[PDB]
Design a protein around this ligand. Sequence first.
Ligand SMILES: Nc1ccc(C(=O)O)c(O)c1
Length: 121
Amino acid sequence: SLLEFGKMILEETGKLAIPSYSSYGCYCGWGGKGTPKDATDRCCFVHDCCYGNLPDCNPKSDRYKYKRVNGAIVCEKGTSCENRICECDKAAAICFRQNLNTYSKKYMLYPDFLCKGELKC
Ligand SMILES: Nc1ccc(C(=O)O)c(O)c1
């Protein structure tokens, strides 16, 4: 679920999902169009694609379980949708962590009209 994803994001990065990743660039929080602005935004682009791979799942609301082994996220077995959603979220949280070094506050609340063009998954 979105709330679980947000908790995972905070755990990984020390930033609150809202507002650090809920309106960032062209793809974080509200996706759609444009060339992703930076690596963090590309995390969101891929995450959006990842959810797009699951048209008959409901990642906003469906809850999954995960645990930590060391610092590593391990998705626990639920329904197939839950497993796949968890893997998408895990990847995005790791991706955010991997790209914290280039995160830029100037991309928060990034205006829609600067996000133009389709980019295929
Ligand atoms: N910020 C970054 C960028 C690249 C890598 C990488 O392994 O290529 C990383 O571990 C962190």
